[PDB]
Design a protein around this nucleic acid. Sequence first.
RNA 1: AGUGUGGAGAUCGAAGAUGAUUAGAAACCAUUGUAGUCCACACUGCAAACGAUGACACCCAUGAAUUGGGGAUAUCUUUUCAGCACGUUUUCUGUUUUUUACGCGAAAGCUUUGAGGUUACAGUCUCAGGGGGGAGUACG
RNA 2: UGCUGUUGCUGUUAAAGGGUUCGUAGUUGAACUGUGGGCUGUGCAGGUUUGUGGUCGUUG
Lengths: 71, 208, 103, 219, 109, 129, 84, 33, 87
Amino acid sequence: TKTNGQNAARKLVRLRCRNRWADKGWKRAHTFSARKANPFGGSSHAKGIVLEKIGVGAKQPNSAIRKCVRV
Amino acid sequence: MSAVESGSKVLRMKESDAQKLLAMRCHIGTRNQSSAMKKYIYGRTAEGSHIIDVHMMWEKLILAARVIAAVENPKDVCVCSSRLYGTRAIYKFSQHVGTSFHGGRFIPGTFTNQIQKKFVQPRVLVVTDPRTDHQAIREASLVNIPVIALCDTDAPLEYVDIAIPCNNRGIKSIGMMYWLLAREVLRLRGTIVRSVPWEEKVDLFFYR
Amino acid sequence: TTKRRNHGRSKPAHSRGRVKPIHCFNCGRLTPKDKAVGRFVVRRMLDAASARDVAEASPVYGANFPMPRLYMKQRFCIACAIHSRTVRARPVGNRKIRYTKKV
Amino acid sequence: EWVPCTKLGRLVKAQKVTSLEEIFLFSMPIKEHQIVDTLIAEGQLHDEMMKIYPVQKATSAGQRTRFKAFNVVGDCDGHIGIGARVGKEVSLAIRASMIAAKLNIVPVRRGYWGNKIGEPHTIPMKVTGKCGSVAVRLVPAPRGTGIVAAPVPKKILEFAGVEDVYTSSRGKTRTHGNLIMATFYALRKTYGFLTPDLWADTEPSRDPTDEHAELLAEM
Amino acid sequence: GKIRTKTVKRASRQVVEKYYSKLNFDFYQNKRVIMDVTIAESKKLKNKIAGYTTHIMKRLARGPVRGISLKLQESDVDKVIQSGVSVDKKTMQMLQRLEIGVPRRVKRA
Amino acid sequence: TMMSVLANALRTIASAERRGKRQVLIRPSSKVVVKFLQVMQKHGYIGEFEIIDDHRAGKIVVNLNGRLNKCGAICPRFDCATTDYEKWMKNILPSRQFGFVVLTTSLGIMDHEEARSRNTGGKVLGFFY
Amino acid sequence: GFFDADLSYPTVRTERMKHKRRRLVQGPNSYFMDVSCPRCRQVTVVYSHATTSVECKGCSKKLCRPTGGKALLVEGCGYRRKPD
Amino acid sequence: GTVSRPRGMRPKWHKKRIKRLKLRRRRMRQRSK
Amino acid sequence: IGMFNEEGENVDLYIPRKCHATTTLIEAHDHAAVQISIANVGPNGVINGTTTTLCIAGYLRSQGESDHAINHITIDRGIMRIKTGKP
RNA sequence: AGUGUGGAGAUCGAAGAUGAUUAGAAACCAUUGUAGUCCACACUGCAAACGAUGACACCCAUGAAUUGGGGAUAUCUUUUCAGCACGUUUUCUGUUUUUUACGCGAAAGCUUUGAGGUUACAGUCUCAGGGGGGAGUACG
RNA sequence: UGCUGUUGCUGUUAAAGGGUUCGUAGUUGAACUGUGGGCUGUGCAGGUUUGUGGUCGUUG
Ligand SMILES: [Mg+2]
Ligand SMILES: [Mg+2]
Ligand SMILES: [Mg+2]
Ligand SMILES: [Mg+2]
Ligand SMILES: [Mg+2]
Ligand SMILES: [Mg+2]
Ligand SMILES: [Mg+2]
Ligand SMILES: [Mg+2]
Ligand SMILES: [Mg+2]
Ligand SMILES: [Mg+2]
Ligand SMILES: [Mg+2]
Ligand SMILES: [Mg+2]
Ligand SMILES: [Mg+2]
Ligand SMILES: [Mg+2]
Ligand SMILES: [Mg+2]
Ligand SMILES: [Mg+2]
Ligand SMILES: [Mg+2]
Ligand SMILES: [Mg+2]
Ligand SMILES: [Mg+2]
């Protein structure tokens, strides 16, 4: 249930503002914690130097050696 | 339904129907009451027996008779009685009015299971007791069959369209009510004369 | 998935808040008095065979003066009521039926 | 060969009942699918198998697999029928669903959006149909809108004969068994809504079984 | 156990209905009668049918039997009006309020 | 605490129409309630109604022909310009062919079709169809 | 029976059973009685639901004793219900 | 068995483990403080 | 009665019956809605050829209120008399 | 439950001990047993603190009941808290409910005691939620 | 995406009514001051006035 009064705009604005943070996609889009944790820093691509070739095993029930590199 | 277009008084109680109703104790109501049947109850006497309003009882009986008399093919109205005491009454009623009858257990699916032999489609269903004929009433609701019932003071009136307030217990009462209905249906048809008393005796309607 | 409308006790939602617990007759488990299964027991002091002998040897007791009987209000926890066959599990439709007099 | 089993069936075969509207007028149940076949003109009744999926019942040795089939029957001119029936084999389910769909045919009322020129193209008013958690809301639309609906309701509405409608489906619409029935239930409500055009008193008429009772008796 | 199966019981009922006059309480004459009016590859069944047929014959002598038709052997109100009805106080009160008035042959008990 | 007398009255009528009652008692009464009832009565959705005086907020007994599918109040009374009639008809009415939105205009309480013809806006009171 | 109720015009039977505030138009259940003192026969107007120590001027004899509802007149007292 | 899955150890004892862990971290920070 | 084209066609498939008690439209799928025909009676006790027919919706016959509804209708039609005459 | 200070300590009893039972048994069972349990004052304010159902207000079908107060009119007791008390029938307001109508709901189920009167979505206010965890954790 | 819901979500059991009260800001908040009147033409509904198959005493 919710408020319905004619002059109850401030309550509805505050209520929606407080509850938008419950949305993970909205919170990520409006907080820098994910941006700082993102290695690309918000970029679509990034350039790097290959350090080592590694073999990452596939998770069960798959069984393979996924060829990956450390960059 | 005593009232008619002409304004006549032919279809009214004649102080003789009242004597027959009173003699057979057709106005005693199981000492129990139902909200649906509260309108038909005149009052409660000592020992707590509800007294059925005779004016309303006669008016509903006339209405039911006029409904039955409008069926051109009398085989299209089925009379049912799961109770033992109504078996001869509905048998005698059918042999006089021309209706189809069915006593004893009502087979589930008689009105709704088409592919079976013994599947019948009556246009009007009349039952002796709504409580014990609940299966016939329940099936009639699925196939557009209106229901006439001999309801007591404690009677489930769910799918009942025409409720006749009477004592649907006891041998004498059930026989008398069907005798009155058969006589009135014949009178409305014109097969007998209202001026002369009906020759058929209620004893033939009595169970055993 | 509410099993019972009354939640297995005689305490509607706006009657009381707490019913003082009682010890089970057999094990001593503390259960609310309304929830515990309570049977009033009128047990004969002696069985028929032995009462015959005692009444034979008693000037006090006989065909005219009956022997005393034990009267106990027994309240069981649910586990002890079930294990002692005082009550059993029932079909879902039969769970609703209730008794008011000792039959 | 068809040997009629009900009084309505005999009346239809004897051509005493010539239109499906007469059956709908008196709310007579249809228990023989040959009634719809004879009353609907040949080549005018179309059917489609909307959905076939298997249903399984666990047993002491493995599990028993049956198939539920949904069939839609419509003339694209205001008559729609939906049938679901489970069979041991797919072919049995499909044939039974076609029979069931014919037995459940209902009339759907068509209305106008604004100007009432030409034949009706949309539903007369906003109606919702609910089955399970799936609810389908049909909203009248102007001409040229088309059926703005999911493919399953759009197929049903095409068979019902509507041209323009706005739809919105809530609930778990991927449950197509409930989605099909919700659309069907929304279409039935069109003729149950009392509009001001239907306020006027209508003269009562006799049902065909009462009208031709003597003919039925001589059988 | 010696429970008669439905095939035995149904045939026994049919025999009794069709050939009631030819049957009596003796198994051996009934068995002879049944062997003439029955085609069955099993003599054990015909013996069992004869046993249950004579059992039904005994029951029929002791009143009716369900499942057997045998369709060869299958006004007090005026007296009460004369003696009076003697209605209750409230019932009499209802009659006094009627258009026809209080009917004759009634009392207040 | 009852906050809207009109909403209470329209809720009571809608419940009675759903149950198929022949008459319904409305309590309390008001000028706005009577004006709303007269609008519905004008278009034929209700029959005769009687106002009973009790030297307080009175009572109304409304006779009901079964023509009223649903009536309800809109709270709060949103402002409605003459250009907003089509928006409200779309949102709350079952169709563009029948049903009425009731407005409080400076010219009085009237249905949306009448208000549109008079070129006047106002506040939405409720609806019926 | 056969007489469907009218909300505007209730039957005296149903309306008489209504609570005083549940009637179509609410009204009092009380009334006034002119009471004759059992000592002087002086007429005193006493409220039916009186709760405060009614005394007859003169003898100063308690005419009624308050109760949960209607007052209880003293024994051997002559009262008649006044109109309106 | 009046309850559904705890899904990864009884939550009461997990809360107890977290509580003891909180106390240990508290004492460590107190030592450093 | 029913929807009408601008030109004047009736457009509607059919005009459903309305319950004589609650005026609700009687749909084609309820299967509990009934039609009851009451024979008209002339000045003599015999019945005429005409009848009076009333339609009752299925839901009213489910609530148990069809008997009350028929009583009210029959009284309004002048077929049934509310009270017995004066003695 | 826990904490502080006084008192109390009959009963029962976390910790602990011992005897059993066990492959092991730091448990269940037996005998004990400290803190506690009880009281006063002061803290604590974390419960399945549940009707797992926020508050106020309106409509709402049926039958038996039940608690308290009032209206009206078969039975029992009736030498003083007594012109009594109970009890019968009917009614009424207020309370805790029960059995079996719409309607609602994913269903279990709810139903004048709503979870009904909601896509035909608007009586008023307010609190909370937005896949599972990490985590009611880290930091302040 | 009616999964941010003013339109337009959910909160018995799925995530979610605060343990209970009180309570400022804030939101919301019961009725009433009020039918205009005749006149005319024009199309509708029912309080009574002469006349013209039913019940009812015996023309009523
Ligand atoms: Mg309380
Ligand atoms: Mg508690
Ligand atoms: Mg219990
Ligand atoms: Mg378990
Ligand atoms: Mg469980
Ligand atoms: Mg869970
Ligand atoms: Mg403590
Ligand atoms: Mg302490
Ligand atoms: Mg010290
Ligand atoms: Mg000890
Ligand atoms: Mg908490
Ligand atoms: Mg909670
Ligand atoms: Mg109390
Ligand atoms: Mg209830
Ligand atoms: Mg959600
Ligand atoms: Mg939860
Ligand atoms: Mg709470
Ligand atoms: Mg203010
Ligand atoms: Mg105001």
